Amino acid sequence: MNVNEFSNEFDVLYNNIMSNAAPGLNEYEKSVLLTKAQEEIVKNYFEPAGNKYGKGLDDSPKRQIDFSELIKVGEGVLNTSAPTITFDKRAKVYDLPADLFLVINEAVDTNAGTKQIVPISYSDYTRLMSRPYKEPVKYQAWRIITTSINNISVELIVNSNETITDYKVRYIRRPAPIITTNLSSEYGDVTINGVSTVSECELNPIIHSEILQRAVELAKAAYQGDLQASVELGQRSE
């Protein structure tokens, strides 16, 4: 549903049918609300407890198709460009892609075969390094985030005498903003996420209606403007 339709049905659902019509929204306001609804819906549908169904990323066909056009596969770049201080003497630092929203699968290709990366918590790190062995299980590797600047930097811990060749990350791409019109203006160029040009919703058309409905709900909550509406609809930011 290209952005002109986003604006047109936004008007239709917002004010064109209201009994006491509210002032129509500017295109910047509609773009901001649509982008906010996009992020809110993505976070709602990624986590099962964020929506009424209780279903997450791959808990039904609908969720799979929802995040289908947002999934991306990239590689981590070895961070030997500059020195650094790792928390572990035996961890190799890798930089994840910049346009990363959420990681759902990671894998490392070593000389000793491919191994699934298990992101270990700070409590599991302390528990596991109190043990005599302190290495992953046969077909897995460990991961902990390290000092990150401008992008997520990642420490990979593999078994001894293993060299990493590739480090693939299957992640959810950061959604691009929904901008209806060229936001360029003589009085000042405004941006949604650093882009002023027209930006289509690059997700599957299945959730475009949900994004529009959430945008309308946010618009009406802003219209009322009391604390109750803001807190009630702010619970779904998540």
Structure tokens given for 220: 């009406």
CB of 53 to a copy of itself, least distance (A): 5
Q: Which is nearer to a copy of itself, 20 or 81 (CB)?
A: 20
CB of 135 to a copy of itself, least distance (A): 13
How many whole angstroms separate alpha carbon 161 and alpha carbon 138? Answer: 13
**Three-class SS of residue 44?**
helix
How many whole angstroms separate alpha carbon 212 and alpha carbon 35? Answer: 10
Determine contact, residues 90/97, Cβ cutoff 8 Å.
no
CB of 78 to a copy of itself, least distance (A): 16
Q: Which is nearer to a copy of itself, 62 or 78 (CB)?
A: 62
CB of 79 to a copy of itself, least distance (A): 13
Q: Which is nearer to a copy of itself, 78 or 231 (CB)?
A: 231
How many whole angstroms separate alpha carbon 45 and alpha carbon 70? Answer: 13
**Three-class SS of residue 234?**
helix
Q: Which is nearer to a copy of itself, 197 or 237 (CB)?
A: 237
Taking the CA atoms of residue 22, residue 28, residue 29 and residue 30 in that order, the dihedral angle to the nearest 10 degrees is: 80
CB of 141 to a copy of itself, least distance (A): 10
H/E element, 75? strand 71-75
Q: Which is nearer to a copy of itself, 49 or 82 (CB)?
A: 49
